[PDB]
Design a binder for this molecule. Structure first.
Ligand SMILES: [Ca+2]
Ligand SMILES: [Ca+2]
Ligand SMILES: [Ca+2]
Ligand SMILES: [Ca+2]
Lengths: 9, 89, 89, 9
């Protein structure tokens, strides 16, 4: 499940 | 033997698989971090295909500012992933 | 699908198994925390058989001071366990 | 592996 990337950082 | 205990061993096992590749065997350098992500987190994170994403991820995870990701910083990364996973859900 | 991704799902799955038993479904109260430890961490931690050990563990993990262990505090607990696991090794 | 309890706390 793409959880990504700015979320995150 | 329980699934949580399995999870604890996996965390340890995978960090050291990557951290021990080069340089300090107890820290992940950028190339080690990048491969860990690409090889082992492909269902949660988009494959890193650009240098600047590698660089930004390390900048974010490198809390003590030594250019590498140690095991404490790695756990923080895992906390971040696991938190983001619900939500969704 | 990788073992680290399995570890991430386990962390989520087991926390909610216990946190959802009673009261706030997103936090572990003392009885939920105690059973999680006794049932799921028996190879890493000694079975809690005394009220005061339950109480002291919660006091330690309860960082924001609300009497319960939320998912952030749980991850910190996991970080503590995983760190302590090497060393040994 | 008992990792316990004062270690910990
Ligand atoms: Ca290294
Ligand atoms: Ca660092
Ligand atoms: Ca609860
Ligand atoms: Ca709390």
């Amino acid at each position: 499940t793409k959880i990504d990337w700015n979320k995150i950082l | 033997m329980s699934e949580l205990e399995k999870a604890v061993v996996a965390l340890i096992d995978v960090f050291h698989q990557y951290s021990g590749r080069e340089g300090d065997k107890h820290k992940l350098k950028k190339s080690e971090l990048k491969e860990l992500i690409n090889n082992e987190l492909s269902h949660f994170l988009e494959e890193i295909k650009e240098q600047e994403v590698v660089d930004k991820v390390m900048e974010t995870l490198d809390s003590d500012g030594d250019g590498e990701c140690d095991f404490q910083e790695f756990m923080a990364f895992v906390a971040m992933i696991t938190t983001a996973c619900h939500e969704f859900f």
